[PDB]
């Protein structure tokens, strides 16, 4: 199949809380959805397995993707650094969106986030580049351990991740 | 300034017009020389950067000088992005954004915003920012001239 699917372990202070999987919009958006996975796979010898969820705002999103700083001040994409918004043909249309985190026009490198609600006032300003297969009550577990700034309560790691199937 | 209004609270009152053409006599007779400068800081006080472009663009004929004063400002605002790395992430609804040097200096941020990041506990003070990047220029083409 064209759009490939990936999975999240996710970990709570080390105790496993749950798996998400996610759908990746290959069709729609290969280049972002290239830079997800492969990233998820761990592939290039770096990735997401190991970090952490460190910005999670209940009623907004869920984010991470940070491998390198860990801090909303870092993180990098498959092709060396920070690439170009690659279209805004999808929108941020409810709970599950996955979506890219950037820090402006053309700044992606690995940080994402899981929308848990409607966030209509992204659209043209994020890439949406997939959606949340099965785990939605996962990410719902997660952002309980999120703040009003971000701030979480609890260490929330990506324990392990992959490709599937 | 950011003033109480006739109900207490925090709100944009716009410049006053007179103390605008006072500005503007005392750089039309007195020049860009260093009696200027504690003018501009009495004439400012509490300003946004609106405000503060708003006493900038009022001078009718100061072109060399003007053009020496913003390129020092950009320097500052670029000094400032380096100093400054922006945490990415969507801006959820209620808060803002870290403010960029040309948000400090208002070219990309409206009233709106400024007065944001002003009103917070604890603030952005992005009009006494921006304002020490004016008297920094000003230092320099009053040194100039």
Known sequence: ?????????????????????????????????????????????????????????????????????????????????????????????????????????????????????????????????????????????????????????????????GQLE | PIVQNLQGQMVHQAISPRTLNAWVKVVEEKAFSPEVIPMFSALSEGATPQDLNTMLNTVGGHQAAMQMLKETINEEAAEWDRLHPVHAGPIAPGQMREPRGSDIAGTTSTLQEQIGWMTHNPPIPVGEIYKRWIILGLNKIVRMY
């Open chain 1, 1 to 161: 199949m064209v759009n490939p699917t990936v999975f999240f372990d996710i970990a709570v202070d080390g105790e496993p809380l749950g798996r998400v999987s996610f759908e990746l919009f290959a069709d729609k958006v290969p280049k972002t959805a290239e830079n997800f996975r492969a990233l998820s796979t761990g592939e290039k010898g770096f990735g997401y397995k190991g970090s952490c969820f460190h910005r999670i705002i209940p009623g907004f999103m869920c984010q991470g993707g940070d491998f390198t700083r860990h801090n909303g001040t870092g993180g990098k994409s498959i092709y060396g650094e920070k690439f170009e918004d690659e279209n805004f043909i999808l929108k941020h249309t409810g709970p599950g969106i996955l979506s890219m985190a950037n820090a402006g026009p053309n700044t992606n490198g690995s940080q994402f986030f899981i929308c848990t609600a409607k966030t209509e006032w992204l659209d043209g300003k994020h890439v949406v580049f997939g959606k949340v297969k099965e785990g939605m009550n996962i990410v719902e577990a997660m952002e309980r351990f999120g703040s009003r700034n971000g701030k979480t309560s609890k260490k929330i790691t990506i324990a392990d991740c």
